[PDB]
Write a protein that binds this ligand. Structure first.
Ligand SMILES: [Ca+2]
Ligand SMILES: [Ca+2]
Ligand SMILES: [Ca+2]
Ligand SMILES: [Ca+2]
Ligand SMILES: [Ca+2]
Ligand SMILES: [Ca+2]
Ligand SMILES: [Ca+2]
Ligand SMILES: [Ca+2]
Ligand SMILES: [Ca+2]
Ligand SMILES: [Ca+2]
Ligand SMILES: [Ca+2]
Ligand SMILES: [Ca+2]
Ligand SMILES: [Cl-]
Lengths: 17, 256, 261, 17
């Protein structure tokens, strides 16, 4: 669970909204 | 004019100098180089092999606008000056400052007129004076070369390619770096990179840089319109104090 | 002279940051190296770096971005016989986006909008069967890993739509040949007919399945940069919501003419 | 304008929805 994991997740969530 | 030569030989306007257009092109070349010399099929075929080996980068036996551009424009010292700085452009905030300044109507796209302003300022920065017709020529050439989908506009990723933007900053961070201490070091290195004004908040092109880089972790190169959409999306969900800026506390909250 | 492994070592040396591109200083360093190899007696100068760079980039920068990616270096220095990457180029160029989307839909089998390691493994397995080669399972895992590392640009362990496009050398957007000047009712009819005929590969008078996909990719890419797998499914659903009046999941010629005006 | 103009317009509208 590196900080890059949180960035990827935020990007994916915003790209699915 | 580079454009006039392109338009003359791409007779049917299909995006390729191919078949007879290409033999006509190489017949024209022989006359330019050797006006005194008679055109023969052998010499058309000889100059064609030669130039297609040097310039047919896509290996399809046709010339497209970029391949013709390579043939004529890099022979011009002032055109090559457009693509020279000493320092690599590896910070997306510096790129976004140029994007936001020259997208002067905020359309999410760079028009011919806006690109002309960018080239004019670029020549002033190198204390070069270019004749107005050469400035128009370079602007038209750049539009035709770098406008990939032919809508008469440069998108965000087109300007990135023109300015040789290096986009590996978030790709250095690793899934392995799982320890609370490592997560803090990376978050701080990330915030420090985009926080170019060192105010502890991401303002203006600092938000833009962060959004472009973050979105491009999971999707292909984004558009100007995409940038404005995802920027407003980041603000809606992270700008808790509604000041239009992303404070370090807000981003840490939004991420975890 | 050079073989697959040694080609890789040269690629890995100069793609220092492992981002998939020889760019900026990596590229000047590459062409500095080249001058010494060709002309050992000669002194390296900025003019000569810039002259050998222009020369080789004009011949081999096929994507016209001022960077080298692995295929462009392979074209420059790797003899064809040793080009493992040439496994993905057929005798016929792939110039119909519907034929591309049939491959995308087959291997993105769940329509997740991405090709995973496991899905890429299926693609390589079938590709070896098409060349009547049998590859042992451990070697197939190796090849899959190598291919994922080579073509995965944003390092999420997945291939997007434009990654498969690059792997299969998908040609230019068919719709870019059509002109705004072609304003006459007769010209508008000839272009509409030529356009529908192109995507209507099954010749049923409707766009079905990968025919819709090809049309949506090509149409969206007239106004925006290369779209994602997820974007393709979003804009596909958007086209059906607004044009599939009879709700049969197909775009009849009449439906598209209506939606366009 | 040509039929390509209608395609571009539909793309732009769908890209803004
Ligand atoms: Ca032509
Ligand atoms: Ca070519
Ligand atoms: Ca603008
Ligand atoms: Ca464009
Ligand atoms: Ca700041
Ligand atoms: Ca705030
Ligand atoms: Ca690199
Ligand atoms: Ca390239
Ligand atoms: Ca999938
Ligand atoms: Ca990827
Ligand atoms: Ca059909
Ligand atoms: Ca229908
Ligand atoms: Cl590798």
């Amino acid at each position: 669970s590196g900080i890059i994991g949180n960035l990827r997740h935020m990007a994916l969530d915003m790209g699915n909204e | 004019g580079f454009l006039q030569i392109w338009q003359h030989f791409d007779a049917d306007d299909n995006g390729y100098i191919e078949g007879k257009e290409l033999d006509d092109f190489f017949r024209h070349m022989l006359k330019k180089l050797q006006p005194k010399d008679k055109i023969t099929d052998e010499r058309v075929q000889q100059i064609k092999k030669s130039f297609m080996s040097a310039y047919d980068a896509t290996f399809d036996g046709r010339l497209q606008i970029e391949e013709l551009a390579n043939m004529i424009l890099p022979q011009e010292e002032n055109f090559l000056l457009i693509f020279r700085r000493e320092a690599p452009l590896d910070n997306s905030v510096e790129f976004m400052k140029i994007w936001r300044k020259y997208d002067a109507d905020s359309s999410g796209y760079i028009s011919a007129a806006e690109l002309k302003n960018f080239l004019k300022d670029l020549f002033l920065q190198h204390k070069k004076k270019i004749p107005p017709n050469k400035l128009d020529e370079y602007t038209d050439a750049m539009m035709k070369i770098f406008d990939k989908n032919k809508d008469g506009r440069l998108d965000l990723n087109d300007l990135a390619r023109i300015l040789a933007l290096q986009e590996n900053f978030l790709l250095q961070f690793k899934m392995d770096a799982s320890s609370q201490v490592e997560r803090k070091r990376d978050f701080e290195k990330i915030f420090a990179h985009y926080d170019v004004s060192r105010t502890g908040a991401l303002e203006g092109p600092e938000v833009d840089g962060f959004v472009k880089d973050m979105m491009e972790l999971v999707r292909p190169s984004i558009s100007g319109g995409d940038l404005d959409k995802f920027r407003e999306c980041l603000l809606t969900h992270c700008d808790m104090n509604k000041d239009g800026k992303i404070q370090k506390s807000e981003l840490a909250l939004c991420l975890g």
